[PDB]
């Protein structure tokens, strides 16, 4: 009314459920009253206290009964395994971010969305066709507020997407194939062993390999960039650091283009989702950043033979930071608009 | 004459047991059972990523394995008394899985289709006696149907622990192994299943403390020793590859060099000792279950009191492998 | 007055204190000198693989850069006798090298057109005073030529092996600190210049033994502990950020309990205490010298004697770093 | 030309690529090294060569003696000389040096190795000018005539790229083409962060706890390979936290529509003894220690095609190190052999 605080839960206290936390600390418009994952709040509390890749949490954090309180404020804290079984709304929760990695479909999502339950689902990963795909600063003026659930995309895609749209808006794409070099994630397995998904790949150790895999995030682009549909495809190579990630995209344009224009039109298309940079950095030099997508001058590069072009672009993410940073945005959004 | 091992659990013990199986004659695998796809084990069977490629050839076929060109059946039984040890000649079982870690759970392996004894990769309990091999199976009279194997840890610790004991006499001590990281590490900060917030941690990123028990229970293995060590775990970001270090006081006086001839006197199929400057590297793969490394001993002397210490390098997985395989083929035989 | 410093050697311990002493009203470094250019220099102050991004702005300039608004010249002279700290004003050098840690070497830079004193960034021999920052800097009285800092291992290590001598009296004791992997060791496999066969080997692949002679030597930081410690490292893959282990006998029996509550009445600006299970990550870039671990404590009572084993964190970069510049302002402050 | 036939081989610099040449020449019938240079300490070379971080322990016993090394009960000189025209090689039997030191990358730099008492011919370990040959052995070793003094056996990512881009070109021609190398860290990077002597402000950066974008020749200088695409092929590289192992991707239009199927075929077809094919889903630790200098991985294939224009990807394995090494130790034998 006068002063709109919209209430959200996070199911999934994982790296994105506990940075998303961390960033909706100084987020006027949103607070999380509820978190549910496995575990006790012992465990949830010393994991938002005590962070590896992302440092020390900004402020105090004391476990008490059933949740523990976040400089002062309690967030209660449940341990269901069912989205069906979380009583959501006895904490006025609105909007639930899942963050679990099991729930990302429309069908799966909506498990949350019920009398006792939340209104609304952001999805913290791809959640199918079916579901609208937000990029913030790329696409986010195709939610109107009415959407049940909606999706904040894969860190990937955030990243490749408004280095693509920039390439699109300003040349004209053909096609392009992305190899995107990524920190290893809590999916793979962090010595040799089973993998529960199948996967014979992250089966591997994860800090001890350089592992190919699987990415969706350039053959569904056209869910945020309608005029790239089919057009991008891609793969992964995922190698031993715990966080830091880089998107190099190989495309041909539909205009005759040079380095210098090339970098000077993302340069134009930076803001605060898209990050420009022609510092020599390094994978480390990333982690932690609020851009989703940081273009990187440096390694570009326009290959001309026989009057044809391959043209090569390159942008770093944080995929844990950048990732929230754009999922938060996103989620203040949508909430300020809902309906 | 042949010793048929069944292999119940094809995790990191259970897969290495298999290979170093492969390359001592006289033992041999003649079952494996797991609960997962074995399109999967087999993939994870040829290729490992701290000891190597497989040794030779793996293929997938109905049933089991083609491994090296011979059939290995491949079964995916949950419940021991639903495996038939017996049809494939199994007289003892591996018993790697962790979900049968006592007399009366390990026992289910032996029935009117089963085996005839079996070693638990882990802890047993009370009336599972604790077997390093070469430093206590002299305690096996072939009339146990459950025996530990003991820990990692613990067969590295055993061997240079009754050596000082044998040697000099241990008053007390304390333990550390710098230890790589295993599997019930999270890959990053997550929530631990066991509720342990150390092992909680990203294992390939920090240097973790953990707790230990192979030292306050060596009195299982080396009796003399009851209640006279403790110890604890730094966990390091290597994926294999251990060192245990122990300092001890004694009952005699020492020098460094008595120390290191003491260890070498000791040196067996199990125990090695070298002189020289190695790093974990260069123990990832061995067969002892322990190496014990002489450049490292000190020997203080203040005012008259001396304290001692004793390092031992240890592949806690091949060479706790090793030691197990050793165990497998003796109680075996003992009959 | 500011007293005005130099940095010998813009290395990890370099770098680290130039960007501490941007936040030190009573010093500023107005000369650096190393072997490469200010290109270089600036992008490593800049970018940090463990401690972060710097907080401010440098830009490059001709012969040095600007930092936080200030010019800072930037020299390339291989040999100290010849780098002209006098032409900058320099009044105190921190010879962060690696390369000449001894009096007689570190003395090379006091000269007319040089430095007035030194500060090495290492232990720096017998014949140096050698202070831990806050268990005994009382021991400078500003006339001294060349001091020490000592070293990473040995800041952590003096507040609380002061602490067991106060409270209860070291009979003995072993130290291990599990260290992380430094640039003196090889990246991968190959000669080492030192002649280390340890530090020859794949730093960030390997467990690595190596000697340390913090525990020998802290007698000069704590004159009663002379001789009755001794110790070792293993060095491993993290790249900074670092635990130090000491069982010791005690000349009276006590409980954990007894041993806790001592360090944490020991606890001030150098030495922290903690009750939380942590782990390496958690000290990168703290200000503490040491800190105590409470969940590591043990004391062994077997036959009624006793074992003590008490933990300390340190992240030898930032740990050592910020121990280094309260003695450096300290010494700066009562320089005669 | 020894009369017992065996070629004899000198090793100038003992790094990696020098140990590890001399570690599989001891299995390679008929050829053996007789003498090593490297100004290094003997007693610090021998324990490198004995423990091997990435490549394991020696396959034998390794002792110092008087002016070199009893490896395996066979006494093998070394000697520490700074000058190439100061070693002897000619006194120990030596027709052929590997020159693994980095410092005489050049024809008249590397034929200081030739002289009255010296050598006969040199294999440089690195690209080596444009007097000098660069040989891929597999690919184009067909274009010495013995004639030769110096070549080049080109660099460990020529190695892995040349089959792959040769089977392209021979089967389906290329157009142009972009490669990405995702590469072990190496010892030209630091360790922790600090000042690189070549001036790289990336190769500065911490090797093992940083992905590190990096310049790479192998993919320009193509045409001292395969002249017909000279020119066609640019590159780069991403250095990543693995020790040893690395994987080569190439992005290329070609002459005609071709499907992952064909693609993968026409490498199959190429396979030799060094360039391998799999179909199994490795990851880079599989390929330590290998043999081949380049291993075609047929999971990682696309074909692309949109509005009828297709982008190919072809992407193949190589042990930066063994691969590397296991094409020298070719090259080296049979150049020595069309010598004579
Ligand atoms: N880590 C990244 O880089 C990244 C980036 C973008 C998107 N994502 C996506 O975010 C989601 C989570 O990824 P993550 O890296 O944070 O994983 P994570 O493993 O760190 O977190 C998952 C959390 O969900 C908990 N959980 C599992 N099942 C649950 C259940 N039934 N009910 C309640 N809690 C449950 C787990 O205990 C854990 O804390 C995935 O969909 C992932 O694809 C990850
Ligand atoms: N954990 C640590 O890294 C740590 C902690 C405490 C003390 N120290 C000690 O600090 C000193 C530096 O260690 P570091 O880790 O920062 O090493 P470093 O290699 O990062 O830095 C050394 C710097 O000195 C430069 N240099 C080398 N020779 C030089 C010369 N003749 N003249 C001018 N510059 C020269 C180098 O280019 C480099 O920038 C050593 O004495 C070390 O023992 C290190």
Redesign the interface.
């Known amino acids: 009314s006068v002063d709109m605080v919209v209430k959200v839960g996070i199911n999934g206290?994982?790296?994105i459920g506990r940075l998303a936390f961390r960033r909706i600390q100084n987020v006027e418009g949103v607070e999380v009253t509820r978190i549910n994952?496995?575990?006790?709040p012992?465990?949830?509390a010393?994991?938002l206290?005590?962070?590896?890749?992302q440092?020390?949490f900004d402020g105090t954090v004391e476990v008490k009964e059933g949740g523990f309180e976040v400089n002062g404020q309690f967030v209660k804290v449940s341990a269901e395994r069912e989205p069906a079984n979380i009583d959501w709304a006895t904490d006025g929760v609105e909007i639930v971010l899942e963050a679990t990695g099991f729930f990302a479909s429309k069908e799966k999502a909506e498990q949350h969305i019920h009398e006792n339950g939340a209104k609304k689902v952001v999805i913290t990963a791809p959640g199918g066709n079916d579901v609208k795909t937000v990029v913030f600063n790329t696409n986010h003026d195709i939610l109107d507020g009415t959407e049940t659930v909606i999706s904040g995309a894969s860190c990937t895609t955030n990243c490749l997407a408004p280095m693509a749209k920039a390439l699109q808006d300003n040349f004209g794409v053909?096609?392009?194939?992305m190899?995107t070099?990524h920190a290893?994630?809590?999916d793979?397995?962090?010595?040799?062993?089973?993998?529960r998904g199948?996967d014979?790949?992250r089966?591997?150790?994860?800090?001890?390999?350089?592992?190919?895999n699987s990415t969706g995030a350039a053959k569904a682009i056209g869910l945020v960039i309608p005029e790239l549909n089919?057009?991008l495809?891609g793969?992964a190579?995922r190698?031993?650091?715990?966080?830091?990630?880089?998107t190099?995209l190989?495309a041909?344009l539909e205009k005759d283009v040079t380095v210098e224009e090339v970098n000077a039109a993302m340069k134009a298309a930076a803001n605060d989702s898209y990050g420009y940079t022609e510092?020599?950095?390094?994978?480390?030099?990333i982690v932690?950043i609020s851009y989703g997508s940081l273009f990187?001058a440096?390694?570009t590069?326009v290959?001309t033979?026989?009057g044809?072009q391959?043209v090569?672009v390159?942008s770093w993410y944080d995929n844990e930071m950048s990732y929230t940073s754009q999922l938060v945005r996103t989620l203040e959004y949508f909430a300020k608009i809902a309906k």
């Open positions: 206290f994982g790296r994952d496995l575990t006790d012992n465990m949830l010393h994991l206290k005590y962070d590896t890749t440092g020390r053909k096609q392009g194939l190899t070099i290893y994630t809590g793979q397995m962090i010595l040799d062993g089973p993998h199948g014979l790949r089966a591997r150790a994860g800090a001890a390999n350089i592992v190919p089919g057009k495809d793969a190579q190698v031993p650091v715990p966080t830091g990630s880089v190099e190989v041909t510092d020599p950095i390094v994978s480390s030099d932690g990187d440096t390694q590069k290959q033979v026989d044809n391959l090569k390159v």
